[PDB]
Structure formats: structure tokens, C-alpha cells
């Protein structure tokens, strides 16, 4: 609606205390506090940050993952009513900073790749779930609804957020453009899997996905990712073959403007930290002169989108 505001955002390139919600929530709050001390109005965290990404489903067969990690991973997922979530809400309230942290929500016995949009006032704006996990990731997590695709009118800007390979979903992109994002939080895990063999998993592939999202939709993208450090190897890997599967590093946190140019100097693929940038929403009205997929540069008489935002439930009562 309005493209005037100017503010500062933070993107977090960090690893979690693997499959330890209590330790990772402490790490998250410290990262929240650090960014707030820098005057940031929004801080974003990687995907499924709190318990950590379940790399065990990529490094070994399903039985190996199930036997050793499934119970531990499930036990460390956060229920929306858990105290850990309240700690994140309190942390955002105390430091007066909006937080977009990706958790592994637990609902009964199923897990979801949830993103918590926490306002600076400490309110939970939304807890959207990933519409569809990726490849073997579908054996761990369930699916979301069309209500999980939304854009929230935060006081500083209209905020949206998608998980990992939801940036390869062409129609999910358009639904988000149609709601007029101007700040997008893209959460990824450490994209160091199968690096020699599958280029699609390489940091290069996911940088085009994130850069194109900003370039295609004329939005600022706040890219946050995890890092596969040696601590990760001591957790998942059991031999040399598995260590090759999840290479080192894989973190590519970025801040990208509507023109696709990075607004913050990227960190190393293995280094952790936070990077900051100044967001001026007037930089979008400049980028929307050329292209606007949902506006002047669209042909609804030829191509249109059917978007269903109903919140379907297994039991409707």
C-alpha cells in the first residue's frame, strides 16, 4: 500500500544446538538481543532453527534415521503452547524487535516446518506452515494449507516468509506477489547436501532462487540459513561416507534489494554471524517501473491464479 518507510533488518547465519530446543532457544534469544542492540526492526532466523534441520534423513536410510534420531527430533519439537515459544515471544517484546524464526512445530504426533512471525509487541502474528516439504523431507513433516500462504501488515512493512524450496513453487510466488510484499524472509537450511553430485542443492542454486524472488516480485528478501559446521558432523555423520553427504558450511545468508543486488556483504559459507542492511521501501517503486507481475505487467485475460485460502482441518466439528 505505502512504499515510504525506511528501517533496518538483520539476517542470521547460525547453527542450532542440534536437537536441543532449550539450548537453541537460548541461542536464538541472544541473537535476537544482538540484532536489537543494532537498532534492527526485524530479525530473521533459519528454517527449522530451534531443534535444527533433520539432516539424518539425507545421510542414511530411513531406518537408521528413525532408530537414532526420530524420537529425539520429535521430542525436541515445540508445541505452540510450549514455554519455549513464550520465551521467543517475551524476547521479542523485551527487545522491541520483530522476529521471524523457523521452528519445527509439533501438533499431536506430526511435525510441521512452521515459521513464527512475532511482532515487536510480543504478539504472534502468524505460525504459517510449509505448504509442501521437499523430497524425503516429506517423511518427517506434514503439509500446510492455503491459509499458510499470507502476507502480514507489520508496522514497518508488509511481511511475507517462505521456507526453503517454496521459492521454486511458481504459483506460491505469485500468491505472495498478489498480496504486495515488500519484505520477504527466506529461511533455508545449510544447503551443503550432495554437493558434487546434485548441483540443485548447491548454495549457487538457492542463491538464484532467492535473488529471483526479489527480482521477480520486486521485494526485499532477507535470506537466513543454517550452517553445517564440524559440530554437525559429530552429530549426524557416523563414517567418512556420511561426512561427504553433508559437506561443510552451506550458509548463504543475504539481504537482497528489489533489483536483486545484495545490500549486505555476505559472510563465508562456513562462518556464522548476523548481517545487517537498511531497507528503503522507495527502492521498490523504482523497481516496479520496469516489471510488476501482478500489476501493469500482467494479462489476466490470458493467465490467472486460483488461490484457495480456506483453513482445512481434519475435524471440522
Active site amino acids:
47
Cell 556483504 locates to: 265
Q: For the segment 82-141, give every residue that binds its own copies (CB under 8 A).
A: 107-111, 131-132, 134-136, 138-141
Nearest to 237 by CA among 4, 29, 56, 26: 56
From residue 157 to residue 176, the character string flagging contacts with ligand HBX as x (rule: CB under 6 A) and all else as - is: -------xx-----------
By residue count, the chain amounts to: 317
Kindly state whether residue 145 participates in binding ligand HBX, applying the rule CB under 6 A: no
All cell numbers assigned to 2: 505505502
Distance CA 137, CA 92 (A): 30
Residues in a beta bridge with 188? 225
x/- map, 192-231, its own copies, by CB under 8 A: -xx--xxxxx--xx--xx-xx--xxxx-------------
43 near 27, Cβ under 8 Å?
no
193 binds ligand HBX (CB under 6 A): yes
246 binding partner (options its own copies, ligand HBX, none; Cβ < 5 to 8 Å by kind): none
Q: Does the footprint of its own copies cover residue 287 (CB under 8 A)?
A: yes
Site membership for its own copies, residue 268 (CB under 8 A): no
Told to check if 286 binds its own copies by CB under 8 A, we report yes
59 binds, among ligand HBX, its own copies, none (CB under 5 to 8 A by kind): its own copies
Min separation Cβ 97 and its own copies, Å: 27
Cβ-based neighbours of 30, under 8 Å, separated by 6 or more: none
Q: Looking at 5, 134, 169, 298, which residue binds ligand HBX (CB under 6 A)?
A: 134
How far apart (Å, rounded) are the C-alpha atoms in residues 271 and 146?
A: 36
164 binds, among its own copies, ligand HBX, none (CB under 5 to 8 A by kind): ligand HBX
Nearest of 86, 96, 101 to residue 37 by alpha carbon: 96
Task: Tell me if 207 contacts ligand HBX by CB under 6 A.
Answer: no
Grid cell of 283 as nine digits:
527502492
Q: What is the DSSP letter of 135?
A: G
Which residues, including other chains, have CB under 8 Å from residue 231's CB and lie 6 or more apart? 15, 18
Q: Which of 33, 286 has the CB closer to its own copies? A: 286
Binding site for ligand HBX (CB under 6 A): 47, 134, 164-165, 189, 193, 201, 290
Amino acid at each position: 500500500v505505502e512504499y515510504t518507510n525506511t528501517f533496518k533488518v538483520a539476517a542470521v547465519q547460525a547453527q542450532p544446538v542440534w536437537f536441543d530446543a532449550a539450548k537453541t532457544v537460548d541461542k536464538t534469544v541472544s541473537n535476537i538481543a544482538e540484532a536489537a542492540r543494532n537498532g534492527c526492526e526485524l530479525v530473521a532466523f533459519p528454517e527449522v532453527f530451534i531443534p535444527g534441520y533433520p539432516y539424518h534423513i539425507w545421510v542414511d536410510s530411513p531406518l537408521a534415521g528413525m532408530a537414532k534420531f526420530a524420537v529425539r527430533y520429535h521430542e525436541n519439537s515445540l508445541t505452540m503452547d510450549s514455554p519455549h515459544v513464550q520465551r521467543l515471544l517475551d524476547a521479542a517484546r523485551d527487545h522491541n524487535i520483530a522476529v521471524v524464526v523457523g521452528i519445527s512445530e509439533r501438533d499431536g504426533g506430526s511435525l510441521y516446518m512452521t515459521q513464527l512471525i512475532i511482532d515487536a509487541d510480543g504478539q504472534l502474528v502468524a505460525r504459517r506452515r510449509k505448504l509442501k516439504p521437499t523430497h524425503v523431507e516429506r517423511s518427517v513433516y506434514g503439509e500446510g494449507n492455503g491459509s499458510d500462504i499470507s502476507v502480514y501488515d507489520m508496522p514497518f512493512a508488509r511481511l511475507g516468509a517462505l521456507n526453503c524450496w517454496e521459492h521454486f513453487q511458481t504459483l506460491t510466488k505469485y500468491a505472495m506477489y498478489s498480496m504486495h510484499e515488500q519484505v520477504h524472509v527466506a529461511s533455508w537450511p545449510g544447503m551443503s547436501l550432495y554437493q558434487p553430485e546434485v548441483p540443485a542443492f548447491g548454495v549457487d542454486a538457492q542463491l538464484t532462487a532467492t535473488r529471483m524472488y526479489a527480482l521477480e516480485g520486486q521485494t526485499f528478501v532477507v535470506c537466513t540459513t543454517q550452517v553445517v559446521t564440524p559440530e554437525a558432523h559429530e552429530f549426524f555423520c557416523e563414517n567418512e561416507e556420511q561426512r561427504k553427504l553433508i559437506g561443510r558450511g552451506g550458509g548463504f545468508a543475504r539481504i537482497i534489494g528489489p533489483d536483486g543486488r545484495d545490500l549486505a556483504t555476505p559472510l563465508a559459507e562456513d562462518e556464522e554471524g548476523i548481517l545487517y542492511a537498511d531497507i528503503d521501501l522507495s527502492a521498490i517503486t523504482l523497481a516496479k517501473q520496469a516489471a510488476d507481475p501482478v500489476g501493469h505487467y500482467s494479462r489476466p485475460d490470458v493467465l490467472s491464479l486460483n488461490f484457495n485460502q480456506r483453513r482445512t482441518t481434519p475435524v471440522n466439528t
